[PDB]
Design a protein around this nucleic acid. Structure first.
Length: 619
RNA sequence: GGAUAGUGGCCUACCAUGGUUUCAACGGGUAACGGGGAAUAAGGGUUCGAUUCCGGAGAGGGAGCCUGAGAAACGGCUACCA
RNA sequence: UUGUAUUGGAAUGAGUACAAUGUAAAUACCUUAACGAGGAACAAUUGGAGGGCAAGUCUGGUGAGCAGCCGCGGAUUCCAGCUCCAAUAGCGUAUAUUAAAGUUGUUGCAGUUAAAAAGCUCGUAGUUGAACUUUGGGCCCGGUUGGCCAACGGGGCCUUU
RNA sequence: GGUGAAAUUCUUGGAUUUAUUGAAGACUAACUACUGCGAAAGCAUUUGCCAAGGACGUUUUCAUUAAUCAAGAACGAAAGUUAGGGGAUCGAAGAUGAUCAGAUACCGUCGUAGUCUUAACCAUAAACUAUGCCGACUAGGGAUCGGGUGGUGUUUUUAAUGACCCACUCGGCACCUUACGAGAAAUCAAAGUCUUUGGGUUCUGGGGGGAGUAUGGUCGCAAGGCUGAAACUUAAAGGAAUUG
């Protein structure tokens, strides 16, 4: 324009015309104060609503579990020293589950003791507790091969709350300052796993043991997310009726139960309940979901994986052809692509190696908007709720009766399923290695995975994590030595994103188990296409100002012609293309972005579709 | 005139029409107990003081009262509200 | 007489402990017989290395990370290893406040063109308001400080008082 | 007739043009400027009446009666509102002609309200010298407006007066040169007498947006005027000057 324009601190009316196309309240001191008071009334009423569940003998019991980390201890010493401070000897037998009422704190406690021989039974016991009491020895320090693995495993499945306890520190008395030196060491060790806690009690002192007892009675535990969104109960008694109709009585602790649900027992699988009653009766009204799943030579094997993984780490996906081998018949299935992130590979491809189940598989899409929606309905439909004394009748196959034990001697526990979780789908897991598991893991090798209560034998497929616009990703032969990774298989879905633990059975080990890794249920996503990449390679050997010719990549003129269209690249990063076959031995000549030399190598990439394998329960 | 340990609209009867204010009355706000003091050093200032000493107020919220030289007391009593 | 590496005697408390002392009784400090260092493993951390702002043309990887601000990266600024810098039994971060700040200005800001002189004049409260009345000159006493003397202070009398 | 070109329109009952006369309403050319007056808005034909004002002259009179100013008050271009008058010209709205053409690219005909005036309202402008009022001091020069003093000066005549010339002086609108001074620079006789910081006094500002918005109040018949936030967002926005 060329003119110094007009200025004003606020817009002129001329400017506004071109651009074109209840009372406020003062808070008086009284009403300020009044609002704060009536807000506090809500908070206080809300705190009562939480606590009523534990309020007394009429309320629910709190579930305590004792876990000694050293066999030196004997768990009966732990419990006995606690019971003394209750100051009622009427409290203080051929059994490992105990119900106690404490007059001193008007509190109901259930104590469960696991059988320390059965490592897997420890996890199952601790999985249901509100409080886990860790026993430590002042005399002998925990062993890395067993004692620590208890702590590490419990953390990764999740713990409602934890207490550190000592019971025998006087066994190293000279002066109690020497006891304090040891106690400081144990606290520093314990805090490494549980940095929220800074105290370990000495039960040899009356003041500490009373302090522990008070806490168990008075304080509330944390919730466990994946558990409390389901229902669960612990059996007070079990009974059998005629193929069976197994009866359990106990207390509701989760979100709740409905007689039309499905019920999982961790050792035995899914079963249907037929009736419920409250200690009114509820019956399975047949407008219900149903039980349908659809609609020394080993040294050579270990050495093989050790050698193969070392090779794959140096020269990944490189392949050797051989003379008298047809490249077509070997490789015709491979499509060949410029870039996985840009290819239009179809998900539910019709190729014959695709599993027989496809329409048979459940597919969800928006897992997030599915998960939260399902829960909202489930909590509304609950019939029995926390603290209800209940009986339940369950369709129980009579031949499994040989596996039942008296619940007074062994933990028997019951979990409700979410509706579609019985159906199989494509599922995805995060995975990273256990604390020092340096062994090679082959992508096809079978593994046992626990996630939530249930556990399955799985053969995975490994891939790296990224957000490709098409969900196509490279299949990988072995688990990366360091990064987190994504593993894919077919299994029954979980909506709660339970933590997952990865291990392999090994009865040669003291705990019968070898621990491999941990992770999380990410999602069901069938679009998570895996492509098996292959690299062929050949040697450029003669060089001209406009073309280079390459040996050994192919051995027949017919093969050079059939694969002519796939682009070439150098590992030094130049691209190129086949011109034509030269001669009968399968030489070719090619053009590239620039100068090559015999110190470079010429490669080409090809890709094949992969599909997940199915999986089966484990016990 | 009554009442009080005692002065005084402190209260009662009768009578007069006064009292404060742009030198900011009256009203509203304070995550406001006051002071000795604390931090920050060119000088002038700015910000803070629930808290070891001095003074005031209260004992879940309002009101009433016995004993005693002294209390409108709450590790004294009586009633209502929660 | 100063640096860089194989080798030798000396020195000591952290810690433990007989005893005495301490204390209402004790613990600890102060004192002390015995024991107590060679990778003296009896092993010091917390943040940084483009500029503001002390200190890397080092070297390997990569093409999500860093960054109060300016900026780096499709690599002196990312990640890893060497080396180097700063404070050190302490060092970093968040929020509030003070100084540097003459961005609240009494001391001490600014208003043509950068934020800011009201269209114009009258006028009450408020702030502010020309000059003038005993001035000068004598004579005693006189304290302090430094060389009878000088300076600087103070009291009395006379002159129309 | 009108345009870049053309059409609507008027005309052989005579258009446009020429001559002799008359009516109405508005306006005050040239003279007219680096000139005058007024608190500002603003003010231009002649003569009469009414009342007011600055500067100058003064050996008149009173004797501190003064300067600035919250509240309160008078005036306030153009457009706009209500009622009466007037109604030439031009002309928001409205009704109409062409829709072709790149310089003439938005043009032609008719025409309501309005434009003027009387009696009441409204209170805005780039209302600008973009510079608050009162008082003192600091530099050179030749022009001009109003008053006064002097001259043995020219002219109107044989005085006075008037016109002109020369010197001085009070007051005013401006201009040219310079910078002891000042400033970011353009520039400035004040925008000087400031880190060497104090003559009196009124008003306003505190990075850019949200915003002259929301809400409350108050004035107006209405259009609208005055007063006037915060949550949130952002690293610049802005001034002067030269140059690739």
């Amino acid at each position: 324009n060329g003119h110094k324009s007009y200025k004003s601190k606020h817009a002129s009316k001329g400017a506004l015309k071109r651009l074109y196309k209840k009372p406020d309240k003062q808070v008086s001191k009284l009403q300020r104060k009044n609002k704060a008071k009536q807000l506090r009334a809500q908070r206080i009423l809300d705190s009562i609503e939480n606590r009523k569940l534990f309020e007394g003998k009429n309320g629910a019991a709190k579930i305590i579990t004792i876990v000694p980390l050293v066999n030196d201890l004997d768990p009966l010493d732990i419990l006995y020293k606690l019971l003394k401070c209750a100051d009622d000897e009427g409290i203080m037998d051929s059994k490992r589950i105990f119900n106690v009422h404490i007059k001193k704190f008007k509190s109901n406690l259930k104590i469960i003791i696991p059988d320390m021989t059965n490592f897997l039974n420890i996890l199952d016991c601790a999985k249901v507790a509100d409080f886990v009491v860790f026993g430590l020895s002042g005399v002998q320090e925990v062993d890395e091969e067993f004692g620590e693995q208890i702590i590490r495993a419990l953390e990764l499945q999740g713990i409602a709350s934890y207490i550190g306890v000592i019971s025998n520190l006087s066994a190293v008395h000279e002066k109690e300052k020497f006891q304090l030196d040891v106690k400081q060491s144990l606290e520093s060790y314990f805090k490494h796993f549980f940095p929220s806690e800074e105290r370990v009690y000495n039960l040899e002192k009356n003041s500490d043991a009373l302090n522990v007892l008070r806490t168990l009675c008075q304080r509330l535990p944390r919730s466990i997310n994946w558990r409390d969104n389901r229902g669960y109960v612990v059996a007070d008694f079990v009974d059998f009726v005629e193929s069976g109709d197994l009866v359990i009585e106990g207390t509701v602790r989760g979100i709740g139960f409905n007689a039309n649900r499905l019920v999982h027992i961790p050792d035995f699988g899914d079963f249907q309940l037929n009736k419920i009653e409250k200690i009114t009766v509820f019956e399975s009204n047949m407008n219900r979901d149903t039980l349908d799943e659809y609609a020394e030579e080993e040294e050579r094997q270990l050495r093989e994986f050790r050698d193969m993984e070392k090779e794959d780490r140096e020269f990944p996906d490189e392949i050797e052809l051989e003379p008298s081998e047809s490249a077509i018949e070997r490789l015709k299935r491979y499509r060949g692509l410029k870039n996985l992130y840009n290819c239009d590979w179809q998900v539910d491809e019709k190729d014959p190696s695709s599993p027989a189940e496809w329409k048979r598989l459940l597919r969800i899409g928006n897992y997030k908007n599915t998960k939260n929606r399902i829960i909202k309905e489930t909590k509304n439909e609950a019939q029995a709720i926390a603290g209800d004394r209940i009986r339940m009748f369950i369709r129980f196959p009579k031949f499994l009766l040989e596996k039942i034990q008296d619940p007074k001697q062994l933990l028997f526990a019951v979990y409700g399923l979410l509706l579609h979780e019985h159906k199989n789908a494509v599922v995805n897991f995060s995975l990273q290695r256990w604390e020092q598991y340096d062994k090679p893991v082959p992508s096809q090798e079978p593994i046992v995975v626990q996630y939530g209560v249930r556990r399955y034998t799985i053969q995975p497929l490994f891939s790296q994590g990224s957000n490709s616009p098409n969900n196509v990703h490279k299949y990988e032969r072995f688990l990366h030595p360091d990064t987190v990774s994504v593993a894919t298989c077919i299994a029954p879905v979980d909506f709660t994103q339970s933590p997952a633990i990865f291990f392999k059975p090994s009865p040669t080990d003291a705990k019968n188990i070898e621990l491999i890794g941990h992770g999380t249920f990410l999602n069901a996503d069938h679009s998570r296409i895996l492509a098996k990449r292959a690299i062929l390679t050949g040697h450029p050997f003669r060089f001209h100002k406009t073309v280079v010719t390459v040996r050994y990549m192919f051995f027949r003129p017919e093969d050079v012609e059939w694969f002519k269209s796939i682009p070439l690249f150098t590992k030094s990063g130049r691209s190129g293309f086949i011109k034509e076959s030269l001669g009968t031995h399968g030489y070719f000549k090619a053009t590239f972005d620039g100068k090559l030399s015999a110190q470079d190598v010429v490669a080409m990439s090809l890709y094949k579709r992969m599909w997940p394998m199915p999986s089966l329960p484990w016990n």
